[PDB]
Every structure is written in structure tokens, then in C-alpha cells.
Nucleic acid binder design. Sequence first.
RNA 1: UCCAGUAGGAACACUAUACUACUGGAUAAUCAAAGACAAAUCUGCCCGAAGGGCUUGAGAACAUCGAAACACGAUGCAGAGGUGGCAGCCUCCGGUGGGUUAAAACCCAACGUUCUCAACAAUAGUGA
Lengths: 213, 224
Amino acid sequence: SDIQMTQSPSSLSASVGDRVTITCRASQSVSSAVAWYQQKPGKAPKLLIYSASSLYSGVPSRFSGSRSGTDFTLTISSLQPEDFATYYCQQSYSFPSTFGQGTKVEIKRTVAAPSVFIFPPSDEQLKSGTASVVCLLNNFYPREAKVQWKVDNALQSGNSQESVTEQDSKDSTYSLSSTLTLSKADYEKHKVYACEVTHQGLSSPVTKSFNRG
Amino acid sequence: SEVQLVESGGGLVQPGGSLRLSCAASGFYISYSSIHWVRQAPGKGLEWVASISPYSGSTYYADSVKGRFTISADTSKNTAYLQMNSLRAEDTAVYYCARQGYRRRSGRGFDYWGQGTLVTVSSASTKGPSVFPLAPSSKSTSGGTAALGCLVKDYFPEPVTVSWNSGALTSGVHTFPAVLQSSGLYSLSSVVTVPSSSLGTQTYICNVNHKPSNTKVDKKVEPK
RNA sequence: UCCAGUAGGAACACUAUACUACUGGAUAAUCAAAGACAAAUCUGCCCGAAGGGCUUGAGAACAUCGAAACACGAUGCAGAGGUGGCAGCCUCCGGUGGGUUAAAACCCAACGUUCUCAACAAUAGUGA
Ligand SMILES: [Cl-]
Ligand SMILES: [Mg+2]
Ligand SMILES: [Mg+2]
Ligand SMILES: [Mg+2]
Ligand SMILES: [Mg+2]
Ligand SMILES: [Mg+2]
Ligand SMILES: [Mg+2]
Ligand SMILES: [Mg+2]
Ligand SMILES: [Mg+2]
Ligand SMILES: [Mg+2]
Ligand SMILES: [Mg+2]
Ligand SMILES: [Mg+2]
Ligand SMILES: [Mg+2]
Ligand SMILES: [Mg+2]
Ligand SMILES: [Mg+2]
Ligand SMILES: [Mg+2]
Ligand SMILES: [Mg+2]
Ligand SMILES: [Mg+2]
């Protein structure tokens, strides 16, 4: 029915100077009705390429687009500091229109394992009625990481969320927080709380944990 | 240049409720372009939602929004509107209007975009945040360094600002993006790392602002 | 209407004449620009008694353009050879993107109106 645009990769890290390539595959012929856009956190997207390979006026010539069949790729001869951003392919051959998932171009840097800290719920928050357990992965790279919660060695599931910082303008690292949420009842029952971190930086999963009281 | 798009009409609305965005267009005759609305949910990709065609005034919508929304344009006012009915939290997002370039100049590319309006679709009420300390235990410590910070839970709407010691402490401070809980309210925590030695001598206090509720808290984080 | 340059001139080729198109001009019709059927006769299946369209004209789709994805209007101006049809492959031409650059010289890539109908495919000369 509706045409699909499969962009890839979802993320991608490069250094200044690098020649970067983003690809987007249409689920069926789109002729050349494809455009590319740049977007930066909390700001309107900007047109780069139109009609598949035409460079939009005003845009730097290092940017380009090409079409092989139903595959469309956007290139950057020589990555510049302003280019770290996210990019989207879009098809306008048929309605409804569709954008690719997006490709985040990030800054490359040497691997860094996360430090791992764990915070138990405060007595205050306990008096309140709910309990939050916080697990902090700090200053690490690359981004792909994996936090699992286990209480009394049971694998927690769908009862915790996490959030991630932007690359640090300082050391280009990420910091990530995972929060586990229990009812004061659930919490008061079990004794040992732990998160297991799996990161490329660690030669084996790290387990940071504590016991109520 | 002189071409410009400025949307408005976004705000807070209960689910099932209704809201109408407008896109005031200056710098060109709206009636010779094709206008589109495109939305971006918090931490998601761009999603094309609807469009209007010059001359014919044909209309086009996306499956996910077909039937509940209607796009249109007032030549007189050189403006485009999006009527949004039967809103659902699912619909929360930033809404941009964008115009299609001239065939000759930019093919079918969207050459000009609005700054975007924010449409928040919640049935929760404005609440100041609770602020709990994340005490620097022996299980939040590595090397000569120990992490600490305060949890900012259950508040609405965004945003919330956080600082440490009035703002004299900024080195190694990470404040995480808010996270929409299933309770319906928000949550986030700010953390910082510091020399283990200083823990006994130095004070740490996280200043928490929340304009939407004229709330202002300052919890002192401290080893339990 | 005419002149010139060029490309065509349409059942196998070639030339001349008619006739066609683009470009510039006006009987002193300039100087120009432009100029794709070069090479090669490929692969698989199906059909005919015999396979070979740089021709027009009309209807559909589709495309380009008109501030224009549909609707409305105008235009079909670039695709070519490999002999009918379908599919594939090689080459040429074209603009486009990339590479290498003094340079589209050369390299890479995808991409380029089809179908249906009717009429016309000449007169002549020379030849497979
Ligand atoms: Cl286009
Ligand atoms: Mg339970
Ligand atoms: Mg003549
Ligand atoms: Mg001839
Ligand atoms: Mg003339
Ligand atoms: Mg030949
Ligand atoms: Mg036979
Ligand atoms: Mg022939
Ligand atoms: Mg059409
Ligand atoms: Mg007009
Ligand atoms: Mg051919
Ligand atoms: Mg043939
Ligand atoms: Mg054959
Ligand atoms: Mg064929
Ligand atoms: Mg070529
Ligand atoms: Mg080039
Ligand atoms: Mg071809
Ligand atoms: Mg054509």
C-alpha cells in the first residue's frame, strides 16, 4: 500500500574530515521524488537535497545525493563540525508521504567504560508511598549499553525507565540513568537490589547493588 | 529571506479534546504553494501528517491521523490551519508547517519550515515537583570520586531547571532529559561527581526551578 | 515565401528530386551555433505465411511545463543499434550524481515515453 523509506544506520559516529554516507531504501519505485533534511536538537529541519540528487541552493557543496534504482544515499565529502546533527530522507512520489527513521551523526572518540553508581530510595520518598531506585552509568562511550534490574535475583521488567545525555561538549561521552520504581510494599519485601551493566568498555558485565538498610 | 512561517495555537488539551493550529505565512502567496504539516514526537523522528494542494485545494492525510484532522487555508488571511479533533496522548508532539518549494527551484522538497508549536495532550494537572536527594553512599563511589544528585519526581508540565549551589558548581554536572512516567507526570534527576575527600567539608544543594507551578525547591544532598 | 548550415528523405542499401526538423538569417540572406543508427549483430522463452518505420495524424497511459504530485491547461521537444513479441545483456548518445582533474579526457552509478489505430513509406536511377 503505502511506500516505505528505510533509512540506515540509525546512528553513526565519525570524525571531522571523514566522508560520511547515509542510505535510504524505498519499499518500491519512487522515481526521484526524494529529499534529504538536516535537523538539530529542537530546531526546524533544513532542506539539503531535492529531486534525489540536486543540491538545494545555499547548501555547501560537500553535501550530495545520488540515486541507484530505489536506493538513495546522501554523502558528505568532508564532515565539518556543524554537520553533527540528524538526517532524514523523505519521499514525495506518492501520498501519503513518509520520512526515513533518521540518522544521527555523532562525534567519534576512543572507547570509555561507564562508571556505575547506585542510589537507594531516600527515607523521605519512602514516607511518601513510592520507591525509586536509581542506577547511574556515567561518562562512557560509545552509546550502546545495557542495564538490567534484578531484585532478589529476579529479572525486573517493564517497571523501570532510563534517560540519556547528549554527547558531552567536553569529552564527547554519554551518561545514562536507569530508574526502577516499586511500591513501598514491593520494596520493603525484597532485600538485595542490583543493576547489571553491559558495555563494550567492560570485559564482563558490572553488577552494582545494595541491601535495604 | 522574506519568506517566513510562524505557527501558533498549540497548548495543553485533554484526550478526545480538540485544538486548532494555524500557520501564518508571509513573504509569498500561500495559494501557489503546497502546504504540509509535519510532527515530531518527543525523541522520535519526523512524521508527515497532512498537506493541501495549490489550485485544486485537494487534501491529503496520514493513516495515523486521517479522519480526525483537517487541513485548510484562508487565502484572505494567507494562513493555513490544522483542525485536530479527538486528540490522544499518542498525538503529543511538536507541529511544524512547511511549504513545498517551486517545482523549478527545489523540486518537491520542503524548502521553508516553521519554528513549530508544541501540542501537549494530557489529562493531568499542573503539579510542583518532589525533590529527593540521591545520597552519595559507598555504593555510589569510585576511586577518589563519588557521585551524588537529587531525584526530581512527579511534576507537570515541563520544563524544570536545576543547578548546584546557586550555579557555582557546574563541572561534572549531568542533568538528564525529563521522562514521562506512566502516572502521567514527569521525572528526571540531576547528578554530579566530586572528590570523595570534599564530602565532609563541602556542601551540596540542588536548586530546582519549576515556573509552571511557581514552585522553587532546594534540597541539600548529603551522605546518609 | 526565400536563402544557408545541419540532420532526416521514412518495406535492403546508396544518390538525386520532392518533402521534414532545428539554427541563423532576407535575395549582398553573413559570421555562427549545433550535429547520437559509431562498434557490434549478444542471451532465454513465445509467436508468424513472410519479422528490419530518425515519417506523419488522432485516442489511453505516463512524463515535462504552466507558481501546478491530484483536479484544469499546454507540450511530447532524446533516446539509439543489436530485425516480431516478452524478458535480459552489451554498446552508443544524453543530461544528472560521485571519483580523478587543466578537462564529463578518462572511471563509477542509476536514470531517458510507451501502448492502440489509420495513413503514408514517393518518382526515378544504381545496387544486396
Ligand atoms: Cl522531486
Ligand atoms: Mg507487586
Ligand atoms: Mg532549406
Ligand atoms: Mg539521407
Ligand atoms: Mg526560422
Ligand atoms: Mg553501423
Ligand atoms: Mg515460424
Ligand atoms: Mg531500423
Ligand atoms: Mg500526469
Ligand atoms: Mg498565474
Ligand atoms: Mg534497444
Ligand atoms: Mg525492432
Ligand atoms: Mg529475437
Ligand atoms: Mg527488447
Ligand atoms: Mg555516460
Ligand atoms: Mg564531475
Ligand atoms: Mg536504458
Ligand atoms: Mg522524454
